[PDB]
């Protein structure tokens, strides 16, 4: 289960070891950060593994009891389109990985000590003001959306899409920096209620643009839609989509009809407009991740 993956519709990867291989012995697993049926990411210590002879906290992405060869084939295509990606401030980076024979297949990447954005926001409920120091206000919402555009329009550049976009595969570490992920195998899709059983699969819904939901495409302009919906999490400061609506066929429906959530708690009027732009009906009048960075760039600094 990978959501970042290679735009079918730019298409038509090596490893290099000497680069990425990091030793099983440097590295001390301690604490899981997240667990799926067949995987996990858990907190750990490696020794020297970005900058030399200093102990860094990192997160790993490994199988659990239950996966089989093929999670172990997923998890090392996650490894190579990492890899391919390469390095952004707002993409969770790459540090390293475990492939030799003998071991389990452990990916590597950056710790985010402020765990996934949409838990984060919901426990600041208390601590927000627009405009009491470690206090949210409006300015760290504005940026957080600026640094996921950012990402994300990296990502475009990368001729890569993310099928799963939303709060809770965004994570905030030091410096208010926000970082795309994706917890894929690590998260229990079965469990988790933001994914509905539609089919075989189990899909976020609420996140999906309409011609996904009917049509299952997939593109760049169909991640916009999802972040109009990141957007609407931001600045509701973590609350679930489409409050007490049930998720059907009658929902779908009516937002290919032109249903559309109503202003969260804590936007702007630019906010919410910008929101609605991301979930036009048509995939190709909805605002390009660079449009978006440029205008969530002006309304920061018009913020402040
Ligand atoms: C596309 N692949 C990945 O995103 C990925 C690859 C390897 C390992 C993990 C991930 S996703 C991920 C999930 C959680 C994290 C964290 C920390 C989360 C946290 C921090 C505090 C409390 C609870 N959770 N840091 N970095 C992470 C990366």
Redesign the pocket.
Known sequence: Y?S?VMDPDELPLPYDASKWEFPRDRLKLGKP??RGAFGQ?I?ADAFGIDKTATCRT????MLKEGATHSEHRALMS?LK??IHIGHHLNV?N?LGACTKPGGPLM??????????LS?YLRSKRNEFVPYYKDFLTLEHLICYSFQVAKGMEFLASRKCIHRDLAAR?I?L?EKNVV??????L?RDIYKDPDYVRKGDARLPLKWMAPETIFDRVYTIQSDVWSFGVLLWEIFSLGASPYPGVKIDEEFCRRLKEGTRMRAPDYTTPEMYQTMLDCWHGEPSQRPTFSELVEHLGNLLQANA
Do not use: H, R, Y
């Not at 990192?58 to 992405?61: G, T, W």
């Not at 970082?179 to 894929?184: A, E, N, Q, S, T």
């Open positions: 990978l970042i950060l997240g990411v907190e990192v997160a790993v992405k996650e389109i990492l969770v790459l990916v590597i990447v950056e710790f985010c000590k402020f765990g996934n838990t595969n994570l570490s970082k795309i992920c994706d917890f894929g690590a």
